[PDB]
Amino acid sequence: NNYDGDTVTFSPTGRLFQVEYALEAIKQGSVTVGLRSNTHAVLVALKRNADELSSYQKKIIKCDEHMGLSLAGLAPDARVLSNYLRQQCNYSSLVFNRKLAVERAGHLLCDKAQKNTQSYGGRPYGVGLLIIGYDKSGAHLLEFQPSGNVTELYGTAIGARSQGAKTYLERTLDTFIKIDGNPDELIKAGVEAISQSLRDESLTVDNLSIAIVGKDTPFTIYDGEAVAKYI
Amino acid sequence: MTDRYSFSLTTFSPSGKLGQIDYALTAVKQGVTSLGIKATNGVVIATEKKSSSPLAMSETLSKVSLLTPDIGAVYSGMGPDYRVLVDKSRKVAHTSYKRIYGEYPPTKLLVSEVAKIMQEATQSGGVRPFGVSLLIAGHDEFNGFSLYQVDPSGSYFPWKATAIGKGSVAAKTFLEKRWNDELELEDAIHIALLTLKESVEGEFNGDTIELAIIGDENPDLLGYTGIPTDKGPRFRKLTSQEINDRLEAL
Amino acid sequence: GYDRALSIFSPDGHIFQVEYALEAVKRGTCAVGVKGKNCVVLGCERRSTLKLQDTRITPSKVSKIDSHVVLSFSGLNADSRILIEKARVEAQSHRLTLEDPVTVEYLTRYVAGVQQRYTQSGGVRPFGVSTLIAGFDPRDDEPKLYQTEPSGIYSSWSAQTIGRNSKTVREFLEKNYDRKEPPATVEECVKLTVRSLLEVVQTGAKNIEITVVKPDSDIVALSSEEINQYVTQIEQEKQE
Amino acid sequence: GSRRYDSRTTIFSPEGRLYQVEYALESISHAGTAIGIMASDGIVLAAERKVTSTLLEQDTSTEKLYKLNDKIAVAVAGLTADAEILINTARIHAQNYLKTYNEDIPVEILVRRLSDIKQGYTQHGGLRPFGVSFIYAGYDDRYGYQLYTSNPSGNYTGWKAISVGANTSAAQTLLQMDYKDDMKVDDAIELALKTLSKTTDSSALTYDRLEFATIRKGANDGEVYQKIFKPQEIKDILVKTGIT
Amino acid sequence: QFNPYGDNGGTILGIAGEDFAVLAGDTRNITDYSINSRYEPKVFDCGDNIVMSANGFAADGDALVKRFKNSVKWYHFDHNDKKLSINSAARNIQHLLYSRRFFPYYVYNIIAGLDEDGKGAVYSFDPVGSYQREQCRAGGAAASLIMPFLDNQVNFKNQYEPGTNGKVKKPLKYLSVEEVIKLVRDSFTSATERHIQVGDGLEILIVTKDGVRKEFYELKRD
Amino acid sequence: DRGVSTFSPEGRLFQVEYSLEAIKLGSTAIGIATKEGVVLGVEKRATSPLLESDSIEKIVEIDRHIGCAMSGLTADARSMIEHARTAAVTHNLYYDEDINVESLTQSVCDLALRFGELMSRPFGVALLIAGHDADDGYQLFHAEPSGTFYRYNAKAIGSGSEGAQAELLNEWHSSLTLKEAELLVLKILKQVMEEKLDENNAQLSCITKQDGFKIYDNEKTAELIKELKEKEAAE
Amino acid sequence: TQQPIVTGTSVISMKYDNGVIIAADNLGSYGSLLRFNGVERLIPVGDNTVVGISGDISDMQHIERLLKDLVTENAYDNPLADAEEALEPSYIFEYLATVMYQRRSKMNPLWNAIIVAGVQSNGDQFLRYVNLLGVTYSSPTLATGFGAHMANPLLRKVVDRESDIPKTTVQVAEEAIVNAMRVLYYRDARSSRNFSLAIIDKNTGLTFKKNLQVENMKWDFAKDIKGYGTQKI
Amino acid sequence: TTTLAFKFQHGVIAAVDSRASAGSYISALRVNKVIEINPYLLGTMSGCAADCQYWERLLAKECRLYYLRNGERISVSAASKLLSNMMCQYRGMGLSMGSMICGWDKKGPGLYYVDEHGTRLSGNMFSTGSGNTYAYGVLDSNYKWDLSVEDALYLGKRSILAAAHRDAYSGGSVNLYHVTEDGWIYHGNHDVGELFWKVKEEEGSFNNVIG
């Protein structure tokens, strides 16, 4: 109200409204789902078009051979944050001959977002990210909020109507975690999860975007006829 | 962090007034009375040592300050602002003059440097004006004795005699009746003490009054002998006893 | 440094500072530009509220940017000097690095770029100035006349006016200027420029300035008497 | 943050005016009147000190008329402290020019330079403008005797006769009435003092309330002399012209 | 005084075939008269069907290769996983080298692969960035021993057709990958005999449309 | 007042949303992508008859294989064009090749959100970037001041955009020829323009693989307008 | 640019079937003065790596602190710091090699020659060299300074190529290393009798041996050597 | 190295050798010492090959940007100047560059010599490199403005041959270029070994050499 003019101002109840408004931009964004087993981690994203002449906005970005994310909210902010991850993954490889741990990648994103919430002049990032990766401790899935909060999960969803997919994954938890050494079945569970967030529209060939990373699987994105198999 | 106040805090109002300067002058008005009188062979500056507490040692608080051996200053208004201005004035006398010309600046030019500093606090970014009016008395070879007033705006005027602060209006009227162009230094001191008594409520003695003069060279205060051309400072602060002696002939 | 964003969008999609800069131009004295077949004429209004003026030394309204290009303006006088100085420096910088003088279009594009830059840089306000830039490209006999404004847009004009009551003189130029047959001579071009200012000026005395620019760096400013002869001839034909 | 307290000194009004420049001009309209009159054989600068005191040391005082170099002087109207900042800058510019070209700076070039500095404060920096209007009186071998004025906007113009400060409307009308082109310095001296005497807000015009200066080729042969009038000399010229 | 440069010896050789390319180099690493390693790989697969070797000062060679490999990675990121053509890689390397014009990478560099028409390609660089496409290029310590031999046996220089006596040149018939590898092995075996910095082992990387293949051969260890 | 980079309660940047309103006031620009080329067309909208209309430059070459049309505060586009031309030529310097249309567009869009308290405000202009490369063929992009860019088969921006976009919705199909696209741009421009469309107040351009980016002569466009009038009178 | 002041001589090492061995004497020379006799030049990093350093000792102590800080930093926000995300020999080496090359590129080197010896997570032997120029190389045997000239020839007689590594036991490897250290003591004027030896084995882990001495020396034949040619007495 | 270029009736000829040496060792028999800045501009190269390649390819970037901004082809005078100003930035740093900027613009055919010093000279004929003195002799004695394209091409070709023969660091092959108002035209690569014997026989020159 009087306390939402900038990110540097707490409300009387201790809230940060600019951060909450940035969180609101994610809710307006298109749905994306993340889930993993012990061998693989999967991202599924519902891409959004402007109209029938337009392309469908890409949702998934590769950060390294073993890591990548999906976005929901302001796409340019995802490009900035993903570029930062690319650099950090790359710094780890060049200097330490070491693949960047997914947990450490989350810590770096948290700290980068945090600086934008405590300083004058700047603004919070207006995007949410779901980071998947496979490192020395196996498969991982992270959820990033532009408040700075990063959370390691078995599965999750962000964007509009994401609650439906999140409830589904909460029911299916015991099943999909056990899908080891079967990439196609893990993707199926993700496609079925994101289907719980659809209304009026359904998953078409240029609508659906899928990514996967695992034990002997580099981070690879599937679009177009490559996802027709799962429709 | 960083000083993000890079804009002026003093600005012209629709009527053409610079508010912060006017308000700085109001702070000066509330300040304790100080005055200056110029004689033929000297200048006197004086003020009341308004002690905040009787437990405070008012000798440790110097309202009258030496700027150069031949220049002294007194103020009315905010004491802390005055103290830092004295520090800057002493330094600028060296950096912008003595280290260049090998001699101390003349009164009018040191006043000009102090005035410039005060003007800049009226226009520069993220600062308020100084809440003081200064009375600067001094002597130099080619201009002789002089007395200047410097206001929060940075404007300065030369005076034969004047007063600033609390009872300045009444004090200036008192000085107009008594001043002439034939006054000797002792006559000016006498008039200073008379004028200052009117604005003082409580105790009026050497311990509650601060008074200094710009007069003859004091070779006894130089600290060394052997150089004929060096004859000592013209600035001298009168002692508590020296003031009381002149209060008996009052 | 002072970084405050002064030029910003409003809910209706307007940059008010840029639009208020145009209001400063509206207040400025009238300037007019007319290009003939082999020349360009720049006319300028001088408000007669200021007499006791020394016209020898008072900043003239038309300024040479190079030997072959001139610039006139309407709006804040002090603002215009900054644009003129920058333009003059760029003109010499071009001759030095490219070994050709600037084209009129290039010089216009530069000045317009400076104006634009001051509409989305922090800590600065837009120029309260619109300019008319005229001249001839090196080794070219085609007349050139351009206009710039605070927003930074620029365009070429057969004839144009800016400043106070420019609406009225543009009205005149739109009905009097024929594109198929522009003022064939210097006389006709100057006459049409003076006529256009007489719709707005008041007295045709020292209120009208005229500067003629011809090809190959041939630039001259008309005197009071020369202009007065045009003023005389115009009204004598009008008494009919 | 800090934005909250920013007055924004460099913005247009909806009408296309610069608030701070307009308000600075309002400030200057309360300053003592300064007048400049250009003649064929010299220039006169006359200015009124503001409500003075009897205890003010006039002979060492300077609030209106300042020397920029041997050929150029200025009359001030507005904040004296602001003026001195600009004056010292102008003095340096004149010396820079002299060092570079080994010739005295032409009057207009100095005027343009100071006027550009004023302009800058109205367009960038976020600082308040200088609340000062100058009358420049000077001589060079190109245009001879010249009068200029500059105000807080950074706009400058040339004049045959001009006033700044208080009652400029009344003063300019009086100058416009009695000024002629073939006028001489001694006549201009009289016109300036007569104009001040009629426009002044004081009861009577006296020597202690005035500063006076002339720039004359009344220097022995082809050269120019600046004369800042002493208090006694202002008293004499007041008697000569028949005002006191 | 500190000398930031050194010489790690080694010799490399790149030959462009009709539809293939080879980049070979010995595996010996040295300082002065000592051997550091008998097997220290010098020719690398940089991705996108491009092979590379920076011969000379090993520290600068390892840095340049590391940077180019990185440039390939970012080319994919920035341009939608587009394949970096051999000619584009060559131009990119020029700019990597010339960024140190006033403190150069002390290496002679060679890359090999296939052009956009599927033909064999070899590009050669100097330490400061000048480059050009070539058919045959030996670089490093024993470059002067090998190149004259290749001029003779690859481009058939100074060879004429019997009976004509210098009137008709020997025709420039294309060489097979098996033929090129023989010339490579004989080049290095000969260099090993007369150059002390050459020996220990020979590693060859062959580039075709099918991908990158490696071949290793022993050399004399004295 | 309030920050320039402030979020609204709805989760939108005020300044970006307000710049979109400025673009709505701009003159109409239309782009249509086909397998034979991409056509770009604009409404010139001269404010006066004395303004020489051929000096109105709202269609611009970025490279031989990339063109661009603008709508809104067109003065803001100049630095965007300069950056685009530099990016295109610089990539050719570094990589000895043409730059991808998407990569060029992405490079332009990176400038967009570089504003705050960098430039003091977003751009007040939208761009239609049309081009061809070997990897993705003929492409049309819509670059906004939000930093977002959508690829389009056909797109209209400016004051008559929603009316034109509805028309493009019905008319576009994947088998359009270059000639059919040209007439289609002219038809829709004529529909949404205030003044009567002719060769002087409207401009056409195209990008083909063979000939690259070309702005059409007024004589060439005049013939296409006459061809349009006759085919509309044909039924 | 500097010059080394207090210096450490040869560091020698070799691979064997199940791990690596590394050794270095305990001397810190000050030119020809054998100034400091209790200097440890083998620095363990965790339980899988030992970094052996020769050259300037003040720079060695700096590197020692970098490695100590590296371990601290790796543990930060790292639940698997003593498991899957523990420091590897290859991580430690690449970090040092990055630092060494950066420092030489600023013309302010760390005046050292370093050998990183260790065993990787997968049980692979790690042995690589880096020096003040940023030059790196790997070999079955590695040695710095004099060790390069005298130790390598002896150690290469045991492991001449990669295929000899599985055939070489820890007893044979240690014996060869210990003999090499004796030879260096005979022939290097900047060597000491006291040394340290470290064994990093994939089964038995890190064994660090301090206060070792060169023994079984041959000197008796010296009694028969008289004069420099013709002298009989 | 030997490079030359000269202006004549129907444009400008540009001829260069092809050798590169590392001391006495011939590192390259075939380097391209002409840089195709654009279809209307040429640059020869002497000095450091890297400096020539880098700065002249960067000049091409500036010349292309010029055309996009101004909608007009850059002049030879302006192009040569942009290049000379780049050199003046690294004045004293150690760049080594000597090149002739060849082209055709509004003022007709144009030829400018530019070097690392920042020198920029307009002229009808230039030659640089270790063998330039030999080339100048053939050029000066046979050059006319009235030359045909055929004869001019041979002159530049013959002048390089003269240098290739005598100068130890010049040889390999000759590259010819002809610059017209419609752009430059490449006239092939000519082996010096084969060209020498050919010219010796046909022309009768080089009598002292036994063939």
Ligand SMILES: [Mg+2]
């Ligand atoms: Mg050998």
Ligand SMILES: [Mg+2]
């Ligand atoms: Mg030769």
